[PDB]
Amino acid sequence: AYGEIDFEGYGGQKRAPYLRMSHDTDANLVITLMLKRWNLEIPNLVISVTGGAKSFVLKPRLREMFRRGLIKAAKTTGAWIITGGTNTGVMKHVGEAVKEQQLMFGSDTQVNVIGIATWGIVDGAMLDPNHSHFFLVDDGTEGKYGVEIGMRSRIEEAIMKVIGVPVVLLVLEGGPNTVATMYELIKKKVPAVVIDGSGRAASVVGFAYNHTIKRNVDGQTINVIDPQYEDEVRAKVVEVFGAKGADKTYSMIKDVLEDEKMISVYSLDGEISQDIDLAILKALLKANRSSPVAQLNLALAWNRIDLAKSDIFTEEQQWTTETLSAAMLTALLDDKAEFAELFLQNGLSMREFLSLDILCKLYAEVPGNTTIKPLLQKEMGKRQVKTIDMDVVGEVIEELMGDMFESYYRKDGHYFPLPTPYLDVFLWAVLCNRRELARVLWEAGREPMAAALMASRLLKRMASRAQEDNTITDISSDLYDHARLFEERAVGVLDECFNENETLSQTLLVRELDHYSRMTALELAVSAESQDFIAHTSCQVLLTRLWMGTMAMNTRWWKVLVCLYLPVLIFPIIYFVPFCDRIMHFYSAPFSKFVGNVVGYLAFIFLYAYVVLFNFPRFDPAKTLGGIHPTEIVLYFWVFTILIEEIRQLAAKPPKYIKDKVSVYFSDTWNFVDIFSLTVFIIAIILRFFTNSRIFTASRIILSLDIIFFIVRSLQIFSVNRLLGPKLVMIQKMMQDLAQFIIILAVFTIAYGIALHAVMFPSPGIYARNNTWVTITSVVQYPYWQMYGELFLDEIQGEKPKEFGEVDPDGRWLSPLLLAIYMVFTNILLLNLLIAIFNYTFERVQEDSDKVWKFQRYDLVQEYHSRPVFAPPLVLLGHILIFIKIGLSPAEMEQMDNWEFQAAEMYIHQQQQKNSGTLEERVRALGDRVDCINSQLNRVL
Ligand SMILES: Nc1ncnc2c1ncn2[C@@H]1O[C@H](COP(=O)(O)OP(=O)(O)OC[C@H]2O[C@@H](O)[C@H](O)[C@@H]2O)[C@@H](O)[C@H]1OP(=O)(O)O
Ligand SMILES: *[C@@H]1O[C@H](CO)[C@@H](O[C@@H]2O[C@H](CO)[C@@H](O)[C@H](O)[C@H]2NC(C)=O)[C@H](O)[C@H]1NC(C)=O
Ligand SMILES: [Ca+2]
User: Fold this and answer.
1) Where is 834: in which H helix or E strand?
2) Which helix (H) or strand (E) covers residue 441, if one does?
3) Is 410 exposed, middle or buried (0-12, 13-18, 19+ CB in 10 A)?
4) 3-state secondary structure of 83
5) Residue 321: is it exposed, middle or buried by C-beta count within 10 angstroms (0-12/13-18/19+)?
6) Partner of 718 for a Cys bridge, out of 38, 575, 649, 724, CB 3.0 to 4.6 A?
7) Beta-carbon neighbour count of residue 268 at 10 Å?
8) Which of 761, 763, 766 has most ligand 2 atoms within 8 Å of its beta carbon, as the pocket-test mutant?
9) Following DSSP, what letter does each residue of 637-683 receive, concatenated?
10) Sheet with strand 2-5: strands edge to edge
11) Where Ca(2+) is bound, by residue?
12) Do residues 426 and 447 lie in contact, with contact meaning Cβ atoms separated by under 8 Å?
């Protein structure tokens, strides 16, 4: 009789196979049956739980601690649990522990709970319906119990033969057959863990283990009972469990304790909050029979880093890449960053470990609560490929870096050993939003501040992506915190690089970073909008040397101006940091180009203002030159110069394709202001010539309103000043706030204006404004000007009937009431709310204004570094004369990488010294010292 029980509605769809057996059966047949016929996976652990069956008395805090610890030890490992097939005792509570942790839980949570029972008691006692497999071993009549014992010992012997699998024994609250199975498993060299202080037979063993420890023999130095307490343990074994025939179980409970490495005692009141899995791990590392990798992946499954450093990673047992590779895969995939660090620092290298298939697998088993799984799955949806590879990962990284980034998985043939294994496992750890794993993989790999700036860009752009998308879980606060963490890591590396040899810091911030799509550390810092990095002293003296191009870093603007239009007075009073060489080095400076742009642009604004304010006549073919004044021709020349300047800025973008040049060109809004003002000027000067009244009227109005947009373009000039620049950043963010609040202002303005114009001017009547346009513009207009305190009191109360209108007489008293309500709601309440929003914006910018000026100083340097090295009024002639990021040696790049890595090492060491020097870590280490003093005093006493 062999088959599969379907328990009648006792919890669980999955049925449980059973097998009638005998004790004559060798256990190799049983293990090949339960590994081939029943298809159980070979476990990393076999727990054998043993205790009482009928007379089972259990404590509630002990039963909850035991079942929580045993489920935590079995599910995190994937362990077999071997008990009896009995619906009562410790078997019932192990079965209920397995039952209550799987119903409405994860799908791949199935603990194979094997019940080895006797066929002579099933329907003695009923089989437990929460067990998974059943071994029903018998040889004779009913009531027999000893046929379970030997077969249960031999099956676990054969599990250790396939030692291979670390079988452990838990003993708690048992009786005579509990210590019988316990002794037969000790004979099979199964390490036992006894729960002392729990019950009637697991206390006695505890009361015979540490209370009566003694070594008084040769022959591997066994442990025996004390002669002082032999009377007490004999009274306890004859009274507590067992009435008659307790001599054989007393001899048995003595011969259990013969070997010190196979018995271990873990009580409840001794170590309360400590889980039973470390007790199992100490028993397995104490028996000294398991593989190093079996002990290793049990410590991985139980997150036991301290015992792994203590006894698994001893100096006498060395490690290799292939003997740590599966453990490293488990530590990476399950977010075990201290195990990952330990594996990297003992015997493992990412160059030998990480391959292409391991990395694609590493991006395959991302958990799902991260942003990177919806990003990769959306790229698979755009790709129509069922599997993951590095082309998908590289394209996710390209759209998640932005700014024409080119990921090296798309390019390099190794991604279709690896070139940079630390970098791409680091980028994996960053994309998975893993704090300590990305910290460990950042500390381990080269090019550290570029890696940290790229990580900050990835994390805050995933933060923007998860904030802007509803199909991605908003973990944006954790992502911005992680990005800020990598920002301060990059700043600290740059600070340690700047503390010695600032010249190497400047030559390190402008390098050829080939694994970052050939962009520098400054460009990785300004793409990531890392303001604390750009505000560092190294980046600012770099921007000041770039801003003063081969010219002394403190020459004032007036010397540049008087030597800018006088190239003969340039020789005495401009000093250089080392015919025409001094000329081209002076005009090459972006500060010279800046001062020339300021002066020529003030000249342009004055000429534009003379044209729009004083002389912009109509076009007529009667007089010469169409009547166009030659100041307007000089204005056409200089706006054509602005046009050719913006065409040169478009053509001089680092991409090669035209659409990518347009994408890089319209990244800043100043190019939007440029293209808008140029297009509106070209429309105005096309409409200039059509000699119609309305067309020329539109031409001059469009021109006289486009001077506003040229002056709006002139504010990047003001961004040169430390005071004025952040004020313009404030103006920009306040215009964003005003664009957000203008809908609420428009709703209350139009709501008041409709009622106001309805009560003043009722439309089917004699007080009606018989013009739809003056009605609509009154509804828009009069609340808006009344909002600024321009009360139309004499107008809206019926007086001034000429220029306002005949107000309805019943609307002459209701109009001040509506006006008063609108004034207290809009001038007082809404406008001061808008000013409060403006002040909140002011405080947010002013608390960071120094760093935001340092950041926009980069864009100021970039917009003048590319300008033509020519005259400030003749810069179109400079474009005519044109039309007609450093690279180091490979030895220099290697030395610069070594220097950057060593300064990162000093930074990481200083962070460890700050971490170990805090009050909490000092108190923690002092408590560990007090625990060592207590252990030493226990060894003395
Ligand atoms: N495996 C069993 N399943 C169900 N009942 C058992 C079992 N073994 C004995 N008993 C009974 O319970 C009474 C006392 O129960 P305990 O002493 O607490 O059970 P014990 O600790 O000796 O053995 C339990 C078995 O379950 C596992 O802990 C381990 O494999 C071990 O062989 C006995 O007079 C015996 O008397 P009775 O069958 O109820 O007339
Ligand atoms: C707007 O048009 C209406 C419609 O004709 C004018 O209402 C008339 O006004 C005259 C005297 O003002 C009355 O004798 C008529 O009886 C009115 N007709 C209706 C249908 O009410 C109104 O005067 C016009 N208002 C303006 C400002 O032009
Ligand atoms: Ca521009």
Assistant:
1) helix 831-846
2) helix 435-444
3) middle
4) strand
5) middle
6) 724
7) 16
8) 766
9) HHHHHHHHHHHHHHHTSS-SSHHHHHHHHTTSHHHHHHHHHHHHHHH
10) 2-5, 16-21, 133-137, 113-117, 80-83, 46-51, 167-172, 192-194, 263-265
11) 646, 649, 671, 674
12) no
Contact assessment for residue 325 and residue 347, using Cβ atoms and an 8 Å cutoff:
no
Confirm or deny that 288 is annotated as ligand binding: no
Task: Confirm or deny that 806 is annotated as ligand binding.
Answer: no
Residue of minimum CA distance from atom 28 in ligand 2: 770
Exposure of 896 by Cβ count < 10 A (0-12 exposed, 13-18 middle, 19+ buried)? middle
- Domain ends where: 847, 874, 908? 847
881, amino acid identity: L
Q: What are phi and psi of 529, to 5 degrees?
A: 40, 45
Residues 781 and 929 in one domain: no
Nearest atom in ligand 1 to 180's CA? 32
Nearest CA to ligand 2 atom 2: 770
Judge whether 645 is annotated as a binding position.
no
- The answer to whether residues 684 and 702 touch, using CB atoms and an 8 Å cutoff, is yes
Element (H, E) at 821: helix 811-822
**Phi and psi for 169 in degrees, rounded to 5?**
-120, 125
- Report the domain count for the chain: 5
d(CA 553, CA 562): 17
Amino acid at 259: D
In a domain, 448, yes or no: yes
**Residue 712 sits in the same domain as residue 730:** no
Check whether residue 656 and residue 804 sit in a common domain.
no
529 falls within a domain: no
| 153 plus 259 within the same structural domain | yes
Range of the domain at 609: 592-718
Question: Could you tell me the sign of the dihedral formed by the alpha carbons of 5, 9, 10, 11, in that order?
Answer: positive
Number of Cα atoms under 13 Å in the Cβ half of residue 655:
14
Measure 806 CA to ligand 2 centroid, in angstroms.
11
Resolution of the experimentally solved model in angstroms: 2.7
Q: Which residues lie at CB < 5 A from ion ligand 3? A: 671, 674
Closest listed ligand to the CA of 673: 3
Residue 813: inside a domain, yes or no? Answer: yes
Taken as a whole, the chain contains a residue count of 941
826 with 913, same domain: the answer is no
At position 766, the amino acid (one-letter code) is I
User: Ligand 3 centre and the CA of 863: distance in Å?
Assistant: 7
Q: Which ligand 1 atom is the nearest neighbour of the CA of 86?
A: 3
Instruction: Give me the amino acid identity at 243.
Output: A
User: Using an 8 Å Cβ cutoff, are 753 and 826 in contact?
Assistant: no
